[PDB]
Design a binder for this molecule. Structure first.
Ligand SMILES: COc1cc(NS(C)(=O)=O)cc(-c2cc(-c3ccc(N4CCNCC4)cc3)cnc2N)c1
Ligand SMILES: COc1cc(NS(C)(=O)=O)cc(-c2cc(-c3ccc(N4CCNCC4)cc3)cnc2N)c1
Lengths: 286, 291
């Protein structure tokens, strides 16, 4: 009954456009809104089909608003520019946090587990929509972190509306159920977050990754990839291994993951998150 | 062109309903969404007497307003509860209450670091300015320290839309609204809120009768500005006092736009380092415990 139109942001109101990153789908730049006095991020690419792609992603973000989804502030739809405008995330992506070990020599476990929990919450919300929305392109580069390192899921270019129950996060290719797609990616992201290593480190051609996963093989789980000092390491490993099970029916729902995670996160006090973020921003200086 | 329908939340999925507050505009309770696994706040009317279609229209108007005014510093609405046996607006849960509690519960919050105060002021200005930039422009007309919620890291979220339902809070009403001849409202409220945040005092503290407060304000009087209410060791004290006194000018035409206030506030907030904010918030959260 209650319907909301996505605001149309005039391009001329976006000032100080500066390149932040160039990806497969577009270019993300920071900017300042002249009227609202806030900083925004602009993702821009035109063939009418790709214009439809951009508009489709904008509408999906608009309908999928939630606490852990990148909040879209508007769409810029002009003759000379087509871009999605979202909140600006000063702390980049989960990828940077996990792998730039000079910037972030230490990332305290409480922060990692809160990130994992919030990814699970956001994706569960998506899967609980009507109809359920399947993200199908989760990766540590899609997960942005706001000023206090809370998750914002992004990149909804590869998405579907029909659930029932780069490629390093893609499940292997019988009767096929693509409801269990996101959970495989989440398993890989979990292994990544807990290991701070690149999945399939020794692989030089991504097709090697496809062949290995199709053969039932996954990122290595041993003391080197996952030290034994990981909180709830056994439960987390079980979560991971069920998440990337070769059979999609063996993979849990995101609700099961939240059920399985709640005690794990409960082991940490809420203040430790803030402490870890302050340690992060202090050691990143100097 | 791009339209989003506000979700309809089944009442039965709101669990552990716990009364948080009973107010002039409604009743706020905390609850937990069985599917989303998150805590939410539900604003609902009295449960006994059937809701008159005017109250139902008010609730729908508030829900749609929150939905259309979505923004970084506005209370995020997650859905509407529209059932035979319950009608409530569902929003994100703000664990840290309102700006009023932060400013005046000095045992919980003995000290509130200046960077945090100025960030709060800036974010309030941002939220109300966004509100004013909508089409049609939305005038809040009921800004107060009770409407300003603080999320888990003490970032501002403006709340309380729709109307009021009665069937202390006049310190933020300008003197030309006392008798509403239905004719630049919010900025006065913002000036008063600023004076409060920098002073951490009750405006018109020595006045026990609000009717006397209204008389004074109609006479051009405002909260006292001296060394006792605003010590001279306050950062950017002069600039902030000028902003205040211009905001609550007797003449509404003399009060500045929220855009002017944002232009003036931008350098002030610019003097603070990003780590000082995090440190202020964590210091706050730590002294709030063990107290
Ligand atoms: C819809 O438009 C998007 C999409 C996506 N996600 S995506 C990969 O395209 O699917 C992200 C953003 C976004 C990025 C950033 C951001 C902040 C810092 C950086 N860094 C670059 C190098 N390291 C230092 C800083 C990069 C990006 C901040 N806010 C944002 N809303 C905007
Ligand atoms: C849309 O529904 C609303 C409206 C409004 N604003 S309003 C005046 O009603 O228009 C606020 C909230 C809300 C309140 C709270 C909250 C939590 C605890 C407390 N308490 C602390 C202990 N002492 C007693 C008060 C008070 C409020 C936490 N989240 C929230 N979203 C929800």
């Amino acid at each position: 009954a209650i319907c909301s139109a996505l605001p149309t942001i005039p391009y001329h109101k976006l000032a100080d456009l500066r390149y932040l990153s160039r990806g497969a789908s577009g270019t993300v730049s920071s900017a300042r809104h002249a009227d609202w006095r806030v900083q925004v991020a602009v993702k821009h690419l035109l063939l009418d089909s790709e214009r439809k792609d951009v508009l489709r992603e904008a509408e999906i973000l608009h309908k999928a608003r939630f606490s852990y989804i990148l909040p879209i502030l508007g769409i810029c739809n002009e003759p000379e520019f087509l871009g999605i405008v979202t909140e600006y995330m000063p702390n980049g992506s989960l990828n940077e946090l996990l792998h730039r070990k000079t910037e972030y020599p230490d990332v305290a476990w409480p922060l990692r587990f809160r990130i994992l929990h919030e990814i699970a919450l956001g994706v569960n919300y998506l899967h609980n929509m009507t109809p359920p929305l399947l993200h199908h392109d989760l990766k540590t580069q899609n997960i942005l972190l706001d000023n206090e390192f809370h998750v914002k899921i992004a990149d909804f270019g590869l998405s579907k509306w029909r659930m029932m129950s780069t490629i390093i996060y893609m499940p292997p290719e019988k009767s096929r159920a693509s409801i269990k797609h996101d959970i495989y990616s989440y398993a890989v992201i979990t292994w990544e977050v807990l290991s701070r290593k690149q999945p399939f480190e020794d692989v030089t051609n991504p097709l090697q990754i496809m062949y290995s996963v199709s053969q039932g093989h996954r990122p290595v789980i041993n003391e080197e990839s996952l030290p034994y000092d990981i909180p709830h390491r056994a439960r987390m490993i079980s979560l991971i291994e069920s998440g990337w099970a070769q059979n999609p029916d063996e993979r849990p729902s995101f609700l099961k993951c939240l059920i399985e995670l709640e005690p794990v996160l409960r082991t940490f006090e809420e203040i430790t998150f803030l402490e870890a973020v302050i340690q992060l921003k202090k050691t990143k200086l100097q």
